[PDB]
Protein backbone atom coordinates (compact mmCIF):
# COMPACT_ATOMS: atom_id res chain seq x y z
CA UNK A 1 0.00 0.00 0.00
CA UNK A 2 1.19 3.53 -0.77
CA UNK A 3 0.13 4.45 2.76
CA UNK A 4 2.11 1.46 4.02
CA UNK A 5 5.04 2.45 1.80
CA UNK A 6 5.06 6.00 3.15
CA UNK A 7 4.73 4.77 6.73
CA UNK A 8 7.64 2.35 6.40
CA UNK A 9 9.76 4.99 4.66
CA UNK A 10 9.11 7.45 7.48
CA UNK A 11 9.82 4.74 10.03
CA UNK A 12 13.16 3.80 8.50
CA UNK A 13 14.10 7.48 8.25
CA UNK A 14 13.21 8.11 11.89
CA UNK A 15 14.95 4.99 13.19
CA UNK A 16 18.07 5.99 11.29
CA UNK A 17 17.71 9.42 12.90
CA UNK A 18 17.29 8.00 16.40
CA UNK A 19 20.21 5.60 15.93
CA UNK A 20 22.63 8.51 15.65
CA UNK A 21 24.69 10.76 17.89
CA UNK A 22 23.42 14.07 19.21
CA UNK A 23 24.32 17.65 18.28
CA UNK A 24 22.83 20.92 19.52
CA UNK A 25 23.23 24.47 18.23
CA UNK A 26 22.16 27.57 20.13
CA UNK A 27 22.10 31.30 19.49
CA UNK A 28 24.35 32.92 22.08
CA UNK A 29 25.51 36.47 22.71
CA UNK A 30 28.28 36.44 20.10
CA UNK A 31 26.18 34.53 17.58
CA UNK A 32 25.44 30.83 17.13
CA UNK A 33 27.17 28.08 19.11
CA UNK A 34 27.62 24.60 17.57
CA UNK A 35 28.21 21.82 20.18
CA UNK A 36 28.38 18.08 19.32
CA UNK A 37 29.65 14.80 20.85
CA UNK A 38 31.65 13.52 17.83
CA UNK A 39 34.61 11.18 18.75
CA UNK A 40 35.61 10.99 15.03
CA UNK A 41 38.68 13.25 15.08
CA UNK A 42 38.52 13.56 11.28
CA UNK A 43 34.84 13.52 10.27
CA UNK A 44 33.08 16.83 10.90
CA UNK A 45 29.31 17.31 10.86
CA UNK A 46 29.41 21.10 11.22
CA UNK A 47 30.76 23.27 8.42
CA UNK A 48 30.68 26.88 7.26
CA UNK A 49 27.86 27.11 4.74
CA UNK A 50 28.91 30.67 3.93
CA UNK A 51 30.62 33.71 5.44
CA UNK A 52 27.81 34.28 7.96
CA UNK A 53 26.10 30.91 7.34
CA UNK A 54 27.04 27.73 9.18
CA UNK A 55 26.00 24.09 8.87
CA UNK A 56 25.08 21.15 11.10
CA UNK A 57 23.65 17.71 10.41
CA UNK A 58 22.50 14.51 12.09
CA UNK A 59 22.25 11.26 10.17
CA UNK A 60 24.36 9.19 7.80
CA UNK A 61 27.67 10.95 7.28
CA UNK A 62 27.97 10.36 3.53
CA UNK A 63 24.39 11.50 2.90
CA UNK A 64 24.59 14.87 4.60
CA UNK A 65 28.17 15.32 3.45
CA UNK A 66 26.86 15.07 -0.11
CA UNK A 67 24.07 17.49 0.75
CA UNK A 68 26.56 19.87 2.37
CA UNK A 69 28.78 19.81 -0.70
CA UNK A 70 25.88 20.41 -3.08
CA UNK A 71 24.54 23.26 -0.97
CA UNK A 72 28.01 24.79 -0.76
CA UNK A 73 28.33 24.60 -4.54
CA UNK A 74 24.97 26.29 -5.00
CA UNK A 75 25.75 28.94 -2.39
CA UNK A 76 29.04 29.80 -4.06
CA UNK A 77 27.29 29.92 -7.43
CA UNK A 78 24.68 32.30 -6.03
CA UNK A 79 27.28 34.52 -4.39
CA UNK A 80 29.44 34.77 -7.49
CA UNK A 81 26.39 35.25 -9.72
CA UNK A 82 25.04 38.20 -7.74
CA UNK A 83 26.86 39.06 -4.49
CA UNK A 84 28.18 37.65 -1.23
CA UNK A 85 25.68 39.65 0.84
CA UNK A 86 22.73 38.70 -1.39
CA UNK A 87 23.11 35.10 -0.20
CA UNK A 88 20.83 34.19 2.71
CA UNK A 89 20.65 30.96 4.65
CA UNK A 90 16.89 31.05 4.16
CA UNK A 91 17.57 30.45 0.47
CA UNK A 92 19.70 27.46 1.42
CA UNK A 93 16.99 26.16 3.73
CA UNK A 94 14.44 26.38 0.93
CA UNK A 95 16.80 24.62 -1.46
CA UNK A 96 17.49 21.84 1.03
CA UNK A 97 13.77 21.46 1.69
CA UNK A 98 13.17 21.04 -2.03
CA UNK A 99 15.98 18.50 -2.34
CA UNK A 100 14.89 16.54 0.74
CA UNK A 101 11.26 16.35 -0.31
CA UNK A 102 12.48 15.27 -3.74
CA UNK A 103 14.70 12.51 -2.39
CA UNK A 104 11.95 11.39 -0.04
CA UNK A 105 9.38 11.04 -2.80
CA UNK A 106 11.35 9.75 -5.79
CA UNK A 107 14.27 7.83 -4.30
CA UNK A 108 13.98 4.21 -3.25
CA UNK A 109 16.01 4.86 -0.09
CA UNK A 110 15.75 8.40 1.32
CA UNK A 111 18.30 10.18 3.47
CA UNK A 112 17.65 9.68 7.19
CA UNK A 113 19.26 12.98 8.15
CA UNK A 114 17.93 15.98 10.05
CA UNK A 115 19.68 19.32 9.67
CA UNK A 116 20.04 22.77 11.19
CA UNK A 117 20.61 26.01 9.29
CA UNK A 118 22.08 28.96 11.17
CA UNK A 119 22.73 32.48 9.91
CA UNK A 120 24.20 35.53 11.61
CA UNK A 121 24.07 39.22 10.82
CA UNK A 122 26.87 40.91 8.94
CA UNK A 123 29.73 42.66 10.69
CA UNK A 124 28.59 45.85 12.38
CA UNK A 125 25.00 44.69 11.85
CA UNK A 126 22.51 43.79 14.58
CA UNK A 127 19.96 40.99 14.13
CA UNK A 128 18.63 37.99 15.96
CA UNK A 129 20.56 34.99 14.60
CA UNK A 130 18.30 32.77 12.53
CA UNK A 131 17.90 29.03 13.04
CA UNK A 132 16.30 26.72 10.49
CA UNK A 133 15.42 23.15 11.48
CA UNK A 134 14.70 20.94 8.47
CA UNK A 135 13.61 17.30 8.68
CA UNK A 136 14.06 14.24 6.47
CA UNK A 137 10.88 14.88 4.48
CA UNK A 138 11.37 18.64 4.10
CA UNK A 139 9.66 20.03 7.20
CA UNK A 140 11.43 23.28 8.04
CA UNK A 141 11.26 24.81 11.52
CA UNK A 142 12.59 28.14 12.75
CA UNK A 143 13.96 27.93 16.28
CA UNK A 144 14.25 31.30 18.05
CA UNK A 145 16.65 30.01 20.72
CA UNK A 146 18.17 26.58 20.12
CA UNK A 147 18.21 23.53 17.86
CA UNK A 148 18.54 19.95 19.14
CA UNK A 149 19.54 16.99 16.94
CA UNK A 150 20.19 13.29 17.23
CA UNK A 151 19.11 10.29 19.26
CA UNK A 152 16.89 10.79 22.30
CA UNK A 153 15.93 14.42 21.73
CA UNK A 154 13.52 14.73 24.65
CA UNK A 155 15.91 14.70 27.66
CA UNK A 156 18.47 17.18 26.34
CA UNK A 157 15.75 19.32 24.75
CA UNK A 158 13.88 19.60 28.05
CA UNK A 159 17.10 20.24 29.96
CA UNK A 160 17.95 23.11 27.62
CA UNK A 161 14.39 24.38 27.95
CA UNK A 162 15.10 24.55 31.68
CA UNK A 163 18.72 25.65 31.32
CA UNK A 164 18.88 27.93 28.28
CA UNK A 165 19.39 31.60 29.09
CA UNK A 166 19.32 34.08 26.24
CA UNK A 167 22.48 36.16 25.83
CA UNK A 168 24.81 33.36 26.89
CA UNK A 169 28.54 33.96 26.69
CA UNK A 170 30.86 31.44 25.05
CA UNK A 171 31.70 29.90 28.43
CA UNK A 172 28.17 30.01 29.82
CA UNK A 173 26.67 28.72 26.58
CA UNK A 174 29.17 25.87 26.37
CA UNK A 175 28.69 24.87 30.01
CA UNK A 176 24.91 24.85 29.55
CA UNK A 177 25.25 22.95 26.28
CA UNK A 178 27.49 20.23 27.71
CA UNK A 179 25.28 19.94 30.79
CA UNK A 180 22.27 19.41 28.55
CA UNK A 181 24.12 17.04 26.21
CA UNK A 182 25.12 14.81 29.13
CA UNK A 183 21.42 13.90 29.21
CA UNK A 184 31.30 13.86 28.26
CA UNK A 185 34.99 14.77 28.41
CA UNK A 186 36.51 17.46 26.19
CA UNK A 187 37.82 14.84 23.79
CA UNK A 188 35.32 13.12 21.44
CA UNK A 189 33.55 16.54 21.28
CA UNK A 190 33.17 18.71 18.12
CA UNK A 191 32.51 22.48 18.55
CA UNK A 192 32.63 25.66 16.42
CA UNK A 193 31.14 29.14 16.49
CA UNK A 194 29.43 31.53 14.12
CA UNK A 195 30.94 34.80 15.34
CA UNK A 196 29.19 37.91 14.10
CA UNK A 197 32.23 39.70 15.53
CA UNK A 198 34.12 38.19 12.63
CA UNK A 199 34.35 40.77 9.83
CA UNK A 200 33.58 38.47 6.90
CA UNK A 201 33.80 34.76 7.80
CA UNK A 202 31.69 34.31 10.93
CA UNK A 203 32.48 30.59 11.29
CA UNK A 204 35.30 29.57 13.61
CA UNK A 205 36.34 26.25 15.14
CA UNK A 206 37.59 26.04 18.73
CA UNK A 207 39.44 22.80 19.41
CA UNK A 208 42.04 21.19 21.62
CA UNK A 209 43.89 23.17 24.26
CA UNK A 210 41.78 26.31 23.89
CA UNK A 211 38.70 24.12 23.86
CA UNK A 212 39.80 22.31 27.01
CA UNK A 213 40.49 25.65 28.70
CA UNK A 214 37.00 26.80 27.75
CA UNK A 215 35.69 23.73 29.59
CA UNK B 1 9.36 -5.43 3.17
CA UNK B 2 12.33 -3.29 2.09
CA UNK B 3 13.88 -4.04 5.48
CA UNK B 4 13.85 -7.73 4.56
CA UNK B 5 15.77 -7.05 1.35
CA UNK B 6 18.20 -4.64 3.01
CA UNK B 7 19.08 -6.97 5.87
CA UNK B 8 19.36 -9.78 3.32
CA UNK B 9 21.86 -7.67 1.39
CA UNK B 10 23.80 -7.03 4.60
CA UNK B 11 23.82 -10.73 5.45
CA UNK B 12 25.02 -11.55 1.94
CA UNK B 13 27.71 -8.90 2.29
CA UNK B 14 29.21 -10.11 5.54
CA UNK B 15 28.87 -13.75 4.52
CA UNK B 16 30.92 -13.01 1.42
CA UNK B 17 33.35 -11.08 3.62
CA UNK B 18 33.49 -13.88 6.21
CA UNK B 19 34.44 -16.45 3.58
CA UNK B 20 37.18 -14.11 2.41
CA UNK B 21 40.93 -14.21 2.91
CA UNK B 22 42.17 -12.21 5.93
CA UNK B 23 44.41 -9.16 5.58
CA UNK B 24 45.74 -6.92 8.35
CA UNK B 25 47.48 -3.53 8.44
CA UNK B 26 49.71 -2.20 11.23
CA UNK B 27 51.07 1.25 11.98
CA UNK B 28 54.59 0.72 13.27
CA UNK B 29 57.62 2.88 14.03
CA UNK B 30 58.69 3.27 10.40
CA UNK B 31 55.16 3.85 9.16
CA UNK B 32 52.42 1.41 8.17
CA UNK B 33 52.83 -2.32 7.63
CA UNK B 34 50.46 -4.58 5.68
CA UNK B 35 50.20 -8.38 5.62
CA UNK B 36 47.88 -10.41 3.42
CA UNK B 37 47.89 -14.20 3.33
CA UNK B 38 47.60 -14.39 -0.45
CA UNK B 39 48.54 -17.70 -2.07
CA UNK B 40 48.24 -16.05 -5.47
CA UNK B 41 51.60 -14.73 -6.63
CA UNK B 42 49.78 -12.45 -9.09
CA UNK B 43 46.71 -11.15 -7.24
CA UNK B 44 47.27 -8.18 -4.94
CA UNK B 45 44.65 -7.25 -2.35
CA UNK B 46 47.02 -4.47 -1.26
CA UNK B 47 48.30 -1.65 -3.42
CA UNK B 48 49.66 1.85 -3.31
CA UNK B 49 46.92 4.46 -3.59
CA UNK B 50 49.40 7.31 -3.67
CA UNK B 51 52.94 8.38 -2.67
CA UNK B 52 52.15 8.12 1.05
CA UNK B 53 48.60 6.78 0.54
CA UNK B 54 48.23 3.01 0.71
CA UNK B 55 45.60 0.48 -0.35
CA UNK B 56 44.22 -2.64 1.31
CA UNK B 57 40.87 -4.41 1.16
CA UNK B 58 39.23 -7.83 1.26
CA UNK B 59 36.26 -9.31 -0.58
CA UNK B 60 35.54 -10.14 -4.19
CA UNK B 61 38.74 -9.47 -6.10
CA UNK B 62 37.14 -7.78 -9.11
CA UNK B 63 35.04 -5.56 -6.85
CA UNK B 64 37.80 -4.00 -4.78
CA UNK B 65 40.09 -4.09 -7.81
CA UNK B 66 37.64 -1.81 -9.61
CA UNK B 67 37.39 0.32 -6.49
CA UNK B 68 41.18 0.53 -6.29
CA UNK B 69 41.45 1.57 -9.92
CA UNK B 70 38.77 4.23 -9.58
CA UNK B 71 40.34 5.59 -6.41
CA UNK B 72 43.81 5.66 -7.96
CA UNK B 73 42.38 7.54 -10.93
CA UNK B 74 40.68 10.00 -8.59
CA UNK B 75 43.84 10.53 -6.54
CA UNK B 76 45.86 11.11 -9.70
CA UNK B 77 43.25 13.56 -10.95
CA UNK B 78 43.30 15.43 -7.65
CA UNK B 79 47.09 15.57 -7.57
CA UNK B 80 47.29 16.92 -11.10
CA UNK B 81 44.42 19.33 -10.48
CA UNK B 82 45.99 21.04 -7.46
CA UNK B 83 49.15 19.37 -6.13
CA UNK B 84 50.78 16.12 -4.93
CA UNK B 85 50.46 17.10 -1.21
CA UNK B 86 46.77 18.15 -1.74
CA UNK B 87 45.92 14.39 -2.06
CA UNK B 88 44.93 13.37 1.52
CA UNK B 89 43.77 9.81 2.22
CA UNK B 90 40.88 11.20 4.24
CA UNK B 91 39.38 12.59 1.04
CA UNK B 92 39.81 9.23 -0.66
CA UNK B 93 38.17 7.49 2.28
CA UNK B 94 35.21 9.84 1.94
CA UNK B 95 35.01 9.13 -1.79
CA UNK B 96 35.12 5.39 -1.19
CA UNK B 97 32.47 5.63 1.52
CA UNK B 98 30.10 7.59 -0.70
CA UNK B 99 30.57 5.28 -3.68
CA UNK B 100 30.10 2.17 -1.53
CA UNK B 101 26.95 3.61 0.03
CA UNK B 102 25.79 4.25 -3.53
CA UNK B 103 26.52 0.64 -4.46
CA UNK B 104 24.66 -0.54 -1.37
CA UNK B 105 21.56 1.55 -2.00
CA UNK B 106 21.08 1.42 -5.78
CA UNK B 107 23.29 -1.28 -7.29
CA UNK B 108 21.53 -4.63 -7.54
CA UNK B 109 24.14 -6.97 -6.05
CA UNK B 110 26.01 -5.01 -3.36
CA UNK B 111 29.76 -5.48 -3.09
CA UNK B 112 30.79 -7.81 -0.26
CA UNK B 113 34.04 -6.01 0.52
CA UNK B 114 35.50 -4.01 3.37
CA UNK B 115 38.23 -1.48 2.63
CA UNK B 116 41.22 0.03 4.42
CA UNK B 117 43.37 3.06 3.67
CA UNK B 118 46.49 4.18 5.54
CA UNK B 119 48.43 7.44 5.49
CA UNK B 120 51.87 8.41 6.74
CA UNK B 121 53.26 11.89 7.19
CA UNK B 122 55.31 13.30 4.36
CA UNK B 123 59.03 12.66 4.35
CA UNK B 124 60.71 14.77 7.00
CA UNK B 125 57.34 15.23 8.69
CA UNK B 126 56.03 13.98 12.03
CA UNK B 127 52.49 12.64 12.35
CA UNK B 128 50.83 9.47 13.57
CA UNK B 129 49.59 7.17 10.79
CA UNK B 130 45.89 7.50 10.00
CA UNK B 131 43.94 4.28 9.53
CA UNK B 132 40.46 4.15 8.02
CA UNK B 133 38.30 1.04 7.74
CA UNK B 134 35.49 1.17 5.18
CA UNK B 135 32.56 -1.25 5.30
CA UNK B 136 30.38 -2.69 2.55
CA UNK B 137 27.48 -0.38 3.43
CA UNK B 138 29.94 2.52 3.30
CA UNK B 139 30.56 2.93 7.02
CA UNK B 140 33.91 4.54 7.86
CA UNK B 141 35.83 4.16 11.11
CA UNK B 142 39.27 5.30 12.21
CA UNK B 143 41.66 2.93 13.99
CA UNK B 144 44.36 4.53 16.16
CA UNK B 145 46.51 1.38 16.26
CA UNK B 146 45.57 -1.47 13.92
CA UNK B 147 42.99 -2.66 11.40
CA UNK B 148 41.97 -6.27 10.74
CA UNK B 149 40.17 -7.42 7.57
CA UNK B 150 38.64 -10.61 6.29
CA UNK B 151 37.41 -13.88 7.75
CA UNK B 152 36.88 -14.27 11.48
CA UNK B 153 38.12 -10.89 12.65
CA UNK B 154 37.54 -11.62 16.34
CA UNK B 155 40.37 -14.11 17.11
CA UNK B 156 43.24 -12.33 15.34
CA UNK B 157 41.84 -8.95 16.42
CA UNK B 158 41.89 -9.97 20.08
CA UNK B 159 45.33 -11.52 19.59
CA UNK B 160 46.81 -8.28 18.27
CA UNK B 161 44.92 -6.30 20.90
CA UNK B 162 46.51 -8.35 23.67
CA UNK B 163 49.89 -8.45 21.90
CA UNK B 164 50.03 -4.91 20.52
CA UNK B 165 53.06 -2.78 21.33
CA UNK B 166 52.95 0.73 19.91
CA UNK B 167 55.94 1.94 17.89
CA UNK B 168 56.97 -1.66 17.26
CA UNK B 169 59.86 -2.19 14.88
CA UNK B 170 59.35 -3.56 11.38
CA UNK B 171 60.57 -6.99 12.48
CA UNK B 172 58.65 -6.98 15.76
CA UNK B 173 55.49 -5.74 14.06
CA UNK B 174 55.70 -8.43 11.40
CA UNK B 175 56.38 -11.17 13.96
CA UNK B 176 53.41 -10.19 16.13
CA UNK B 177 51.23 -9.74 13.04
CA UNK B 178 52.01 -13.19 11.67
CA UNK B 179 51.63 -14.73 15.13
CA UNK B 180 48.14 -13.29 15.45
CA UNK B 181 47.22 -14.03 11.83
CA UNK B 182 48.13 -17.71 12.15
CA UNK B 183 45.33 -17.88 14.73
CA UNK B 184 51.90 -19.13 8.28
CA UNK B 185 54.55 -20.06 5.74
CA UNK B 186 56.85 -17.49 4.20
CA UNK B 187 55.04 -18.05 0.91
CA UNK B 188 51.28 -17.45 0.46
CA UNK B 189 51.84 -14.16 2.33
CA UNK B 190 52.09 -10.71 0.74
CA UNK B 191 53.46 -7.74 2.67
CA UNK B 192 54.17 -4.10 1.90
CA UNK B 193 55.12 -1.01 3.90
CA UNK B 194 54.22 2.67 3.87
CA UNK B 195 57.73 3.86 4.72
CA UNK B 196 57.64 7.46 5.95
CA UNK B 197 61.43 7.42 5.53
CA UNK B 198 60.94 7.21 1.77
CA UNK B 199 61.51 10.63 0.17
CA UNK B 200 58.48 10.70 -2.13
CA UNK B 201 56.81 7.28 -2.49
CA UNK B 202 56.22 5.75 0.94
CA UNK B 203 54.89 2.47 -0.48
CA UNK B 204 57.19 -0.53 -0.76
CA UNK B 205 56.37 -4.20 -1.28
CA UNK B 206 58.47 -6.84 0.46
CA UNK B 207 58.74 -10.22 -1.26
CA UNK B 208 61.18 -13.07 -1.69
CA UNK B 209 64.54 -13.36 0.07
CA UNK B 210 63.98 -10.27 2.22
CA UNK B 211 60.56 -11.63 3.13
CA UNK B 212 62.24 -14.85 4.24
CA UNK B 213 64.94 -12.97 6.13
CA UNK B 214 62.43 -10.98 8.16
CA UNK B 215 60.47 -14.17 8.76
Amino acid sequence: SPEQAMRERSELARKGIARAKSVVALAYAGGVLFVAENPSRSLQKISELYDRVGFAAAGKFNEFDNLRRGGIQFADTRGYAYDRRDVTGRQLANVYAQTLGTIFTEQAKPYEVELCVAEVAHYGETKRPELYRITYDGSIADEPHFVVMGGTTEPIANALKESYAENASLTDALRIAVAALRALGVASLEVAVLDANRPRRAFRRITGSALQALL
Amino acid sequence: SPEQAMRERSELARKGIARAKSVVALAYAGGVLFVAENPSRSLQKISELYDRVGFAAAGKFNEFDNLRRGGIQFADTRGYAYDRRDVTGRQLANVYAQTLGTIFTEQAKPYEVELCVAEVAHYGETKRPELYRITYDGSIADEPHFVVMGGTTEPIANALKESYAENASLTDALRIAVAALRALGVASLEVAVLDANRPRRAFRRITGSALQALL
Binding site: G16, K21, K60, F61, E63 | G101, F104, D137, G138, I140
Partner: peptide
Protein backbone atom coordinates in the same frame (compact mmCIF):
# COMPACT_ATOMS: atom_id res chain seq x y z
CA UNK C 1 26.48 3.85 6.13
CA UNK C 2 27.98 5.43 9.23
CA UNK C 3 25.79 7.46 11.60
CA UNK C 4 28.73 8.89 13.56
Amino acid sequence: GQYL
